[PDB]
UniProtKB/Swiss-Prot annotation:
Recorded coiled-coil stretches: none
Impact after mutating G284D: Found in isolated hyperparathyroidism; likely pathogenic
Cited function: Essential component of a MLL/SET1 histone methyltransferase (HMT) complex, a complex that specifically methylates 'Lys-4' of histone H3 (H3K4). Functions as a transcriptional regulator. Binds to the TERT promoter and represses telomerase expression. Plays a role in TGFB1-mediated inhibition of cell-proliferation, possibly regulating SMAD3 transcriptional activity. Represses JUND-mediated transcriptional activation on AP1 sites, as well as that mediated by NFKB subunit RELA. Positively regulates HOXC8 and HOXC6 gene expression.
Tissue: Ubiquitous.
Result, substituting W162R: In MEN1 and parathyroid tumor
This protein's encoding gene: MEN1
Result after altering V194F: Found in a parathyroid carcinoma sample; somatic mutation
Protein name: Menin
Outcome after substituting A221V: In MEN1; almost complete loss of histone methylation; loss of JUND-binding; no repression of JUND transactivation; reduced interaction with KMT2A
Subcellular location: Nucleus
Length: 468
Protein backbone atom coordinates (compact mmCIF):
# COMPACT_ATOMS: atom_id res chain seq x y z
CA UNK A 1 0.00 0.00 0.00
CA UNK A 2 1.25 0.92 2.41
CA UNK A 3 -2.10 0.27 4.06
CA UNK A 4 -2.95 2.01 7.32
CA UNK A 5 -2.82 -1.28 9.23
CA UNK A 6 0.75 -1.97 8.09
CA UNK A 7 1.89 1.32 9.65
CA UNK A 8 0.65 1.08 13.24
CA UNK A 9 3.67 -0.75 14.69
CA UNK A 10 6.20 1.88 13.63
CA UNK A 11 8.60 3.02 14.84
CA UNK A 12 10.38 -0.30 15.23
CA UNK A 13 12.64 0.21 18.25
CA UNK A 14 13.86 -3.33 18.95
CA UNK A 15 14.30 -6.86 17.65
CA UNK A 16 10.95 -7.78 19.19
CA UNK A 17 9.28 -4.86 17.38
CA UNK A 18 10.55 -6.28 14.08
CA UNK A 19 9.21 -9.72 15.04
CA UNK A 20 5.80 -8.18 15.79
CA UNK A 21 5.81 -6.67 12.31
CA UNK A 22 6.66 -10.01 10.68
CA UNK A 23 3.94 -11.65 12.78
CA UNK A 24 1.35 -9.08 11.70
CA UNK A 25 2.28 -9.43 8.01
CA UNK A 26 2.28 -13.23 8.20
CA UNK A 27 -1.27 -13.03 9.56
CA UNK A 28 -2.42 -11.07 6.51
CA UNK A 29 -3.85 -12.30 3.21
CA UNK A 30 -0.41 -11.82 1.61
CA UNK A 31 2.62 -10.64 3.62
CA UNK A 32 4.18 -7.58 2.00
CA UNK A 33 7.55 -8.83 0.70
CA UNK A 34 8.75 -5.33 -0.22
CA UNK A 35 8.00 -3.86 3.21
CA UNK A 36 9.61 -6.77 5.05
CA UNK A 37 12.74 -6.87 2.89
CA UNK A 38 13.26 -3.10 3.26
CA UNK A 39 12.95 -3.43 7.05
CA UNK A 40 15.43 -6.33 7.23
CA UNK A 41 17.87 -4.57 4.91
CA UNK A 42 17.59 -1.35 6.91
CA UNK A 43 18.28 -3.10 10.22
CA UNK A 44 21.09 -5.21 8.76
CA UNK A 45 22.73 -2.13 7.25
CA UNK A 46 22.91 -0.35 10.60
CA UNK A 47 23.80 -3.45 12.64
CA UNK A 48 26.37 -5.03 10.30
CA UNK A 49 27.44 -2.58 7.59
CA UNK A 50 27.65 0.68 9.57
CA UNK A 51 27.40 0.49 13.38
CA UNK A 52 28.61 4.08 13.94
CA UNK A 53 26.40 5.66 16.59
CA UNK A 54 24.63 2.43 17.55
CA UNK A 55 23.36 2.54 21.14
CA UNK A 56 20.95 -0.43 21.07
CA UNK A 57 18.89 -0.95 17.94
CA UNK A 58 18.57 1.15 14.76
CA UNK A 59 15.11 2.68 15.13
CA UNK A 60 13.16 2.18 11.90
CA UNK A 61 10.90 5.24 11.59
CA UNK A 62 7.84 5.04 9.38
CA UNK A 63 8.88 8.10 7.36
CA UNK A 64 12.20 6.43 6.46
CA UNK A 65 10.70 3.02 5.61
CA UNK A 66 7.76 4.55 3.70
CA UNK A 67 10.09 6.69 1.60
CA UNK A 68 12.16 3.63 0.62
CA UNK A 69 8.97 1.72 -0.18
CA UNK A 70 7.72 4.60 -2.32
CA UNK A 71 11.03 4.64 -4.23
CA UNK A 72 10.64 0.97 -5.04
CA UNK A 73 7.00 1.02 -6.07
CA UNK A 74 7.47 4.22 -8.11
CA UNK A 75 10.37 2.62 -9.99
CA UNK A 76 8.42 -0.56 -10.73
CA UNK A 77 5.07 0.98 -11.62
CA UNK A 78 6.68 3.68 -13.77
CA UNK A 79 8.70 1.09 -15.72
CA UNK A 80 6.20 -1.79 -16.12
CA UNK A 81 3.05 -0.78 -18.01
CA UNK A 82 0.63 -3.64 -17.28
CA UNK A 83 -1.78 -2.65 -20.07
CA UNK A 84 0.88 -3.85 -22.51
CA UNK A 85 0.67 -7.38 -20.98
CA UNK A 86 -3.00 -8.40 -20.74
CA UNK A 87 -3.48 -11.06 -18.05
CA UNK A 88 -5.71 -13.94 -19.12
CA UNK A 89 -7.36 -15.54 -16.10
CA UNK A 90 -5.41 -13.99 -13.25
CA UNK A 91 -2.10 -15.42 -14.50
CA UNK A 92 0.98 -13.62 -15.80
CA UNK A 93 2.65 -14.02 -19.19
CA UNK A 94 6.26 -14.93 -19.91
CA UNK A 95 6.73 -11.50 -21.53
CA UNK A 96 5.53 -9.74 -18.38
CA UNK A 97 7.86 -11.77 -16.16
CA UNK A 98 10.81 -11.04 -18.48
CA UNK A 99 9.94 -7.33 -18.44
CA UNK A 100 10.03 -7.16 -14.63
CA UNK A 101 13.32 -9.09 -14.61
CA UNK A 102 14.71 -6.60 -17.16
CA UNK A 103 13.62 -3.64 -15.03
CA UNK A 104 15.40 -4.98 -11.93
CA UNK A 105 18.47 -6.10 -13.90
CA UNK A 106 18.80 -2.85 -15.85
CA UNK A 107 18.72 -0.81 -12.59
CA UNK A 108 21.84 -2.46 -11.17
CA UNK A 109 25.23 -0.78 -10.96
CA UNK A 110 27.24 -1.57 -14.09
CA UNK A 111 30.14 -3.16 -12.20
CA UNK A 112 30.46 -4.44 -8.63
CA UNK A 113 31.53 -7.50 -6.64
CA UNK A 114 28.54 -9.85 -6.90
CA UNK A 115 29.72 -12.00 -3.96
CA UNK A 116 29.75 -9.21 -1.37
CA UNK A 117 27.77 -9.56 1.83
CA UNK A 118 24.72 -7.43 2.63
CA UNK A 119 23.52 -6.95 -0.96
CA UNK A 120 20.60 -9.37 -0.73
CA UNK A 121 17.70 -7.07 0.25
CA UNK A 122 15.61 -4.40 -1.42
CA UNK A 123 17.38 -1.94 0.89
CA UNK A 124 20.59 -2.62 -1.06
CA UNK A 125 18.68 -2.42 -4.36
CA UNK A 126 17.32 1.05 -3.56
CA UNK A 127 20.25 2.65 -1.76
CA UNK A 128 23.17 0.96 -3.48
CA UNK A 129 21.70 -0.32 -6.79
CA UNK A 130 23.35 -3.67 -6.00
CA UNK A 131 21.95 -7.18 -5.60
CA UNK A 132 23.48 -10.64 -5.41
CA UNK A 133 22.21 -13.35 -7.76
CA UNK A 134 19.32 -14.71 -5.72
CA UNK A 135 18.56 -11.18 -4.50
CA UNK A 136 17.64 -10.34 -8.10
CA UNK A 137 15.15 -13.23 -8.18
CA UNK A 138 13.65 -12.16 -4.87
CA UNK A 139 13.35 -8.58 -6.11
CA UNK A 140 11.51 -9.77 -9.23
CA UNK A 141 8.99 -11.60 -7.05
CA UNK A 142 8.59 -8.58 -4.77
CA UNK A 143 8.05 -6.29 -7.76
CA UNK A 144 5.49 -8.74 -9.20
CA UNK A 145 3.61 -8.78 -5.88
CA UNK A 146 3.63 -4.97 -5.81
CA UNK A 147 2.13 -5.03 -9.33
CA UNK A 148 -0.66 -7.41 -8.22
CA UNK A 149 0.72 -10.53 -9.96
CA UNK A 150 -0.33 -13.09 -7.38
CA UNK A 151 0.83 -16.07 -9.47
CA UNK A 152 4.55 -15.18 -9.66
CA UNK A 153 6.51 -17.07 -6.99
CA UNK A 154 10.11 -17.71 -6.03
CA UNK A 155 11.61 -21.09 -7.00
CA UNK A 156 14.74 -22.27 -5.18
CA UNK A 157 17.26 -25.03 -5.60
CA UNK A 158 20.25 -25.51 -3.34
CA UNK A 159 22.40 -23.12 -5.40
CA UNK A 160 20.08 -21.10 -7.67
CA UNK A 161 16.80 -19.19 -7.79
CA UNK A 162 14.23 -18.45 -10.50
CA UNK A 163 10.46 -17.93 -10.71
CA UNK A 164 7.35 -19.97 -11.38
CA UNK A 165 4.20 -18.37 -12.78
CA UNK A 166 1.28 -18.78 -15.16
CA UNK A 167 -1.53 -21.33 -15.49
CA UNK A 168 -1.54 -23.61 -12.44
CA UNK A 169 1.84 -22.04 -11.60
CA UNK A 170 3.35 -24.53 -14.04
CA UNK A 171 5.66 -22.19 -16.01
CA UNK A 172 9.29 -21.53 -15.06
CA UNK A 173 11.44 -18.56 -16.01
CA UNK A 174 15.06 -17.70 -15.32
CA UNK A 175 15.25 -14.15 -13.97
CA UNK A 176 18.86 -13.87 -12.72
CA UNK A 177 22.37 -15.11 -13.43
CA UNK A 178 24.04 -18.16 -11.98
CA UNK A 179 27.70 -18.39 -11.09
CA UNK A 180 30.57 -16.58 -12.77
CA UNK A 181 31.27 -16.73 -16.49
CA UNK A 182 28.14 -18.83 -16.93
CA UNK A 183 25.95 -16.88 -19.31
CA UNK A 184 22.43 -16.05 -18.27
CA UNK A 185 19.36 -17.68 -19.79
CA UNK A 186 16.95 -15.06 -18.43
CA UNK A 187 13.46 -15.62 -19.80
CA UNK A 188 13.96 -19.32 -20.59
CA UNK A 189 12.51 -22.32 -18.75
CA UNK A 190 14.55 -24.59 -16.48
CA UNK A 191 13.44 -27.68 -18.43
CA UNK A 192 16.83 -28.45 -19.99
CA UNK A 193 18.47 -28.37 -16.56
CA UNK A 194 15.81 -30.67 -15.07
CA UNK A 195 16.06 -33.05 -18.03
CA UNK A 196 19.84 -33.33 -17.74
CA UNK A 197 19.58 -34.44 -14.07
CA UNK A 198 21.95 -31.75 -12.77
CA UNK A 199 22.11 -31.02 -9.06
CA UNK A 200 21.51 -27.34 -9.86
CA UNK A 201 17.88 -28.08 -10.80
CA UNK A 202 17.39 -31.02 -8.38
CA UNK A 203 15.75 -33.23 -11.03
CA UNK A 204 12.69 -31.01 -10.65
CA UNK A 205 12.46 -31.49 -6.87
CA UNK A 206 13.22 -27.81 -6.22
CA UNK A 207 11.21 -25.60 -3.87
CA UNK A 208 8.11 -23.81 -5.24
CA UNK A 209 7.54 -21.06 -2.68
CA UNK A 210 4.25 -19.62 -1.55
CA UNK A 211 4.33 -16.09 -0.12
CA UNK A 212 5.07 -17.39 3.38
CA UNK A 213 8.07 -19.40 2.17
CA UNK A 214 9.29 -16.28 0.39
CA UNK A 215 9.26 -14.61 3.82
CA UNK A 216 11.28 -17.57 5.14
CA UNK A 217 13.79 -17.08 2.30
CA UNK A 218 14.41 -13.42 3.17
CA UNK A 219 14.88 -14.45 6.80
CA UNK A 220 17.42 -17.11 5.82
CA UNK A 221 19.06 -14.43 3.68
CA UNK A 222 19.79 -12.21 6.72
CA UNK A 223 23.58 -12.02 6.97
CA UNK A 224 24.76 -11.38 10.56
CA UNK A 225 28.44 -11.19 9.56
CA UNK A 226 30.21 -7.96 10.47
CA UNK A 227 33.59 -9.25 9.29
CA UNK A 228 35.57 -12.50 9.12
CA UNK A 229 35.64 -13.07 12.88
CA UNK A 230 32.64 -11.12 14.21
CA UNK A 231 28.88 -11.63 13.93
CA UNK A 232 26.18 -9.21 14.99
CA UNK A 233 24.54 -10.74 18.08
CA UNK A 234 21.48 -8.57 17.37
CA UNK A 235 21.12 -9.96 13.84
CA UNK A 236 21.70 -13.55 14.99
CA UNK A 237 18.94 -13.12 17.59
CA UNK A 238 16.61 -11.42 15.09
CA UNK A 239 17.07 -14.18 12.50
CA UNK A 240 16.60 -16.85 15.19
CA UNK A 241 13.38 -15.34 16.52
CA UNK A 242 11.96 -14.86 13.02
CA UNK A 243 12.76 -18.48 12.12
CA UNK A 244 10.93 -19.67 15.26
CA UNK A 245 7.94 -17.52 14.33
CA UNK A 246 7.84 -19.10 10.86
CA UNK A 247 8.40 -22.53 12.38
CA UNK A 248 5.46 -22.16 14.80
CA UNK A 249 3.17 -21.00 11.99
CA UNK A 250 4.09 -24.07 9.93
CA UNK A 251 5.97 -22.20 7.18
CA UNK A 252 9.28 -24.09 7.49
CA UNK A 253 7.53 -27.45 6.94
CA UNK A 254 8.67 -27.52 3.28
CA UNK A 255 11.97 -25.62 3.77
CA UNK A 256 14.79 -28.07 4.70
CA UNK A 257 17.64 -25.55 4.62
CA UNK A 258 15.76 -23.10 6.87
CA UNK A 259 15.44 -25.85 9.49
CA UNK A 260 19.19 -26.45 9.24
CA UNK A 261 19.80 -22.68 9.60
CA UNK A 262 17.63 -22.62 12.72
CA UNK A 263 19.44 -25.68 14.12
CA UNK A 264 22.78 -23.91 13.56
CA UNK A 265 21.47 -20.88 15.49
CA UNK A 266 20.22 -23.04 18.37
CA UNK A 267 23.63 -24.68 18.59
CA UNK A 268 25.20 -21.25 18.98
CA UNK A 269 22.68 -20.02 21.58
CA UNK A 270 19.90 -22.43 22.57
CA UNK A 271 16.42 -21.10 23.26
CA UNK A 272 14.98 -22.61 26.48
CA UNK A 273 12.17 -25.04 25.78
CA UNK A 274 12.91 -25.50 22.07
CA UNK A 275 14.01 -28.70 20.28
CA UNK A 276 17.74 -29.54 20.27
CA UNK A 277 19.75 -28.80 17.12
CA UNK A 278 19.85 -32.55 16.40
CA UNK A 279 16.05 -32.77 16.40
CA UNK A 280 15.98 -29.82 13.98
CA UNK A 281 18.57 -31.29 11.59
CA UNK A 282 16.50 -34.46 11.47
CA UNK A 283 13.31 -32.47 10.78
CA UNK A 284 15.16 -30.86 7.89
CA UNK A 285 16.06 -34.29 6.55
CA UNK A 286 12.46 -35.45 7.14
CA UNK A 287 11.19 -32.44 5.15
CA UNK A 288 13.47 -33.32 2.21
CA UNK A 289 12.32 -36.97 2.24
CA UNK A 290 8.65 -35.98 2.50
CA UNK A 291 8.36 -33.14 -0.02
CA UNK A 292 11.43 -33.39 -2.27
CA UNK A 293 11.93 -37.16 -2.86
CA UNK A 294 15.07 -37.13 -0.65
CA UNK A 295 16.91 -35.40 -3.50
CA UNK A 296 18.52 -32.60 -1.45
CA UNK A 297 22.16 -32.58 -0.33
CA UNK A 298 22.33 -29.83 2.28
CA UNK A 299 20.04 -31.41 4.95
CA UNK A 300 22.71 -34.10 5.37
CA UNK A 301 25.59 -31.61 5.14
CA UNK A 302 24.02 -29.52 7.93
CA UNK A 303 23.90 -32.64 10.10
CA UNK A 304 27.43 -33.74 9.22
CA UNK A 305 28.85 -30.29 10.01
CA UNK A 306 27.26 -30.32 13.45
CA UNK A 307 28.71 -33.75 14.20
CA UNK A 308 32.05 -32.59 12.80
CA UNK A 309 32.13 -29.53 15.09
CA UNK A 310 31.37 -31.80 18.02
CA UNK A 311 34.08 -34.30 16.89
CA UNK A 312 31.48 -37.09 16.63
CA UNK A 313 33.38 -38.94 13.91
CA UNK A 314 30.97 -41.87 13.65
CA UNK A 315 27.90 -39.71 13.13
CA UNK A 316 29.67 -37.26 10.82
CA UNK A 317 30.78 -40.12 8.59
CA UNK A 318 27.24 -41.51 8.56
CA UNK A 319 25.83 -38.15 7.48
CA UNK A 320 28.44 -37.70 4.72
CA UNK A 321 27.70 -41.23 3.49
CA UNK A 322 24.05 -40.17 3.26
CA UNK A 323 25.09 -37.05 1.34
CA UNK A 324 26.87 -39.25 -1.20
CA UNK A 325 23.86 -41.57 -1.45
CA UNK A 326 21.81 -38.55 -2.58
CA UNK A 327 24.38 -37.24 -5.07
CA UNK A 328 24.88 -40.66 -6.68
CA UNK A 329 21.62 -40.41 -8.66
CA UNK A 330 22.60 -37.10 -10.27
CA UNK A 331 24.69 -36.38 -13.35
CA UNK A 332 27.63 -34.06 -12.68
CA UNK A 333 27.04 -31.12 -15.02
CA UNK A 334 28.60 -27.80 -15.81
CA UNK A 335 27.29 -25.29 -13.22
CA UNK A 336 27.22 -27.93 -10.44
CA UNK A 337 30.69 -26.77 -9.34
CA UNK A 338 29.55 -25.61 -5.88
CA UNK A 339 28.56 -29.13 -4.78
CA UNK A 340 31.75 -30.60 -6.32
CA UNK A 341 33.70 -28.12 -4.16
CA UNK A 342 31.88 -29.20 -0.99
CA UNK A 343 32.48 -32.92 -1.65
CA UNK A 344 36.11 -32.21 -2.57
CA UNK A 345 36.63 -30.29 0.67
CA UNK A 346 34.95 -32.99 2.78
CA UNK A 347 36.93 -35.83 1.18
CA UNK A 348 40.24 -34.05 0.95
CA UNK A 349 40.41 -31.76 3.99
CA UNK A 350 37.66 -32.29 6.58
CA UNK A 351 37.66 -36.09 6.81
CA UNK A 352 41.50 -36.28 6.79
CA UNK A 353 41.76 -33.81 9.65
CA UNK A 354 39.01 -35.56 11.63
CA UNK A 355 40.67 -38.94 11.20
CA UNK A 356 44.11 -37.54 12.00
CA UNK A 357 42.85 -36.35 15.39
CA UNK A 358 41.02 -39.65 15.90
CA UNK A 359 44.30 -41.48 15.27
CA UNK A 360 46.11 -39.40 17.92
CA UNK A 361 43.32 -40.02 20.44
CA UNK A 362 43.40 -43.74 19.65
CA UNK A 363 47.13 -43.75 20.40
CA UNK A 364 46.26 -42.01 23.69
CA UNK A 365 43.96 -44.91 24.58
CA UNK A 366 40.50 -43.78 23.53
CA UNK A 367 37.84 -46.50 23.63
CA UNK A 368 34.94 -46.90 21.26
CA UNK A 369 36.96 -45.01 18.65
CA UNK A 370 35.44 -44.60 15.22
CA UNK A 371 38.75 -45.96 13.88
CA UNK A 372 38.02 -49.31 15.55
CA UNK A 373 34.39 -49.41 14.39
CA UNK A 374 33.83 -51.40 11.15
CA UNK A 375 30.52 -49.56 10.63
CA UNK A 376 32.52 -46.35 10.49
CA UNK A 377 34.80 -47.81 7.84
CA UNK A 378 31.70 -48.83 5.90
CA UNK A 379 30.44 -45.22 6.03
CA UNK A 380 33.72 -44.00 4.56
CA UNK A 381 33.39 -46.57 1.78
CA UNK A 382 29.76 -45.64 1.07
CA UNK A 383 30.78 -41.97 0.87
CA UNK A 384 33.32 -42.75 -1.86
CA UNK A 385 30.88 -45.15 -3.55
CA UNK A 386 28.27 -42.42 -3.98
CA UNK A 387 30.83 -40.02 -5.43
CA UNK A 388 32.02 -42.68 -7.89
CA UNK A 389 28.43 -43.46 -8.87
CA UNK A 390 27.72 -39.74 -9.33
CA UNK A 391 30.54 -39.67 -11.86
CA UNK A 392 29.06 -42.55 -13.89
CA UNK A 393 27.31 -41.30 -17.02
CA UNK A 394 28.09 -37.69 -16.19
CA UNK A 395 29.18 -35.39 -19.05
CA UNK A 396 32.35 -34.51 -17.09
CA UNK A 397 34.50 -36.55 -14.66
CA UNK A 398 34.67 -36.09 -10.90
CA UNK A 399 37.66 -38.03 -9.58
CA UNK A 400 41.32 -37.46 -10.37
CA UNK A 401 44.62 -38.45 -8.81
CA UNK A 402 44.33 -35.48 -6.43
CA UNK A 403 41.57 -37.44 -4.68
CA UNK A 404 43.50 -40.73 -4.68
CA UNK A 405 46.19 -39.75 -2.18
CA UNK A 406 43.64 -38.77 0.45
CA UNK A 407 41.59 -41.92 -0.14
CA UNK A 408 44.69 -44.03 0.49
CA UNK A 409 45.48 -42.05 3.64
CA UNK A 410 41.94 -42.23 5.04
CA UNK A 411 41.65 -45.98 4.36
CA UNK A 412 44.96 -46.53 6.21
CA UNK A 413 43.66 -44.78 9.34
CA UNK A 414 41.65 -48.00 9.92
CA UNK A 415 43.77 -51.02 10.88
CA UNK A 416 43.48 -54.09 8.65
CA UNK A 417 41.63 -56.06 11.33
CA UNK A 418 38.94 -53.37 11.39
CA UNK A 419 38.62 -53.16 7.60
CA UNK A 420 38.40 -56.97 7.37
CA UNK A 421 35.14 -56.98 9.32
CA UNK A 422 33.11 -55.20 6.61
CA UNK A 423 31.37 -57.73 4.40
CA UNK A 424 30.96 -56.29 0.90
CA UNK A 425 28.04 -58.15 -0.68
CA UNK A 426 27.15 -58.22 -4.37
CA UNK A 427 23.68 -57.62 -5.78
CA UNK A 428 22.58 -60.22 -6.69
CA UNK A 429 28.53 -55.11 9.05
CA UNK A 430 27.34 -55.39 5.43
CA UNK A 431 27.76 -52.97 2.53
CA UNK A 432 26.69 -53.05 -1.14
CA UNK A 433 28.51 -50.90 -3.71
CA UNK A 434 26.60 -49.12 -6.46
CA UNK A 435 29.61 -47.82 -8.41
CA UNK A 436 31.78 -49.94 -10.65
CA UNK A 437 34.91 -48.19 -9.33
CA UNK A 438 34.35 -49.32 -5.74
CA UNK A 439 33.28 -52.83 -6.82
CA UNK A 440 36.67 -53.28 -8.46
CA UNK A 441 38.37 -51.87 -5.37
CA UNK A 442 36.82 -54.44 -3.03
CA UNK A 443 39.75 -56.88 -2.88
CA UNK A 444 42.22 -54.05 -2.12
CA UNK A 445 40.30 -52.76 0.91
CA UNK A 446 41.29 -55.45 3.47
CA UNK A 447 45.05 -55.94 3.05
CA UNK A 448 47.11 -55.08 6.13
CA UNK A 449 49.25 -52.79 3.98
CA UNK A 450 47.05 -51.08 1.43
CA UNK A 451 48.33 -51.26 -2.15
CA UNK A 452 48.42 -47.52 -2.75
CA UNK A 453 49.36 -47.71 -6.44
CA UNK A 454 46.55 -50.16 -7.26
CA UNK A 455 44.01 -48.05 -5.32
CA UNK A 456 45.05 -45.00 -7.34
CA UNK A 457 44.70 -46.92 -10.60
CA UNK A 458 41.19 -48.06 -9.68
CA UNK A 459 39.93 -44.67 -8.43
CA UNK A 460 41.16 -42.70 -11.44
CA UNK A 461 40.71 -45.46 -14.04
CA UNK A 462 44.28 -44.62 -15.07
CA UNK A 463 45.30 -47.05 -17.79
CA UNK A 464 49.08 -47.22 -17.41
CA UNK A 465 52.05 -46.82 -15.08
CA UNK A 466 55.28 -44.96 -15.81
CA UNK A 467 57.38 -46.23 -18.71
CA UNK A 468 60.91 -46.36 -17.26
C1 LIG B 1 25.95 -26.02 6.48
C2 LIG B 1 26.95 -25.86 5.51
C3 LIG B 1 27.00 -24.70 4.72
C4 LIG B 1 26.09 -23.60 4.87
N1 LIG B 1 25.28 -23.20 3.84
C5 LIG B 1 24.58 -21.94 4.18
C6 LIG B 1 23.64 -21.42 3.05
C7 LIG B 1 22.58 -22.49 2.68
N2 LIG B 1 21.80 -22.10 1.47
C8 LIG B 1 20.48 -21.76 1.51
N3 LIG B 1 19.85 -21.73 2.68
C9 LIG B 1 18.50 -21.41 2.76
N4 LIG B 1 17.83 -21.12 1.57
C10 LIG B 1 18.50 -21.15 0.40
S1 LIG B 1 17.89 -20.86 -1.14
C11 LIG B 1 19.37 -21.12 -1.87
C12 LIG B 1 19.63 -20.99 -3.38
C13 LIG B 1 19.73 -19.49 -3.78
F1 LIG B 1 18.60 -18.87 -3.51
F2 LIG B 1 20.68 -18.89 -3.09
F3 LIG B 1 19.97 -19.38 -5.02
C14 LIG B 1 20.29 -21.45 -0.94
C15 LIG B 1 19.82 -21.48 0.34
C16 LIG B 1 23.32 -23.80 2.40
C17 LIG B 1 24.22 -24.20 3.60
C18 LIG B 1 28.04 -24.63 3.80
C19 LIG B 1 28.93 -25.69 3.66
C20 LIG B 1 28.82 -26.79 4.43
C21 LIG B 1 27.84 -26.88 5.34
C22 LIG B 1 27.99 -28.06 5.98
C23 LIG B 1 29.05 -28.66 5.42
C24 LIG B 1 29.58 -29.94 5.75
N5 LIG B 1 30.03 -30.94 5.98
N6 LIG B 1 29.56 -27.90 4.48
C25 LIG B 1 30.76 -28.24 3.65
C26 LIG B 1 32.05 -27.91 4.41
C27 LIG B 1 33.22 -28.26 3.53
N7 LIG B 1 34.48 -27.70 4.06
C28 LIG B 1 34.45 -26.69 5.03
O1 LIG B 1 35.52 -26.25 5.43
C29 LIG B 1 33.24 -26.23 5.56
O2 LIG B 1 32.13 -26.50 4.71
Amino acid sequence: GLKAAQKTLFPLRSIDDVVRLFAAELGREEPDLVLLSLVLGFVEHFLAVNRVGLTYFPVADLSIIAALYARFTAQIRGAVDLSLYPREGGVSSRELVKKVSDVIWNSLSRSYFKDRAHIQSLFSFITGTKLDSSGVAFAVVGACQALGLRDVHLALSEDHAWVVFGPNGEQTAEVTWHGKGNEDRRGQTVNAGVAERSWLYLKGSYMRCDRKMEVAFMVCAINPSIDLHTDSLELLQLQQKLLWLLYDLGHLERYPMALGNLADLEELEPTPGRPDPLTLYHKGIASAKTYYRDEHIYPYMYLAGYHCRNRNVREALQAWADTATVIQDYNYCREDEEIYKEFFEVANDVIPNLLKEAASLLEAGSQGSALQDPECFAHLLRFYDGICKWEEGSPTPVLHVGWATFLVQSLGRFEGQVRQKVRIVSVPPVLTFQSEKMKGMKELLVATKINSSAIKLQLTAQSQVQMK
